[PDB]
Amino acid sequence: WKLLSKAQEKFG
Numbered sequence: 001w002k003l004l005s006k007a008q009e010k011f012g
Helices: 002-009
Strands: none
Touching: none
8 A cells, every 4th residue: 555655656
């Protein structure tokens, strides 16, 4: 969720 997109956002 937000905890996955927020952290992944800076990875993708």
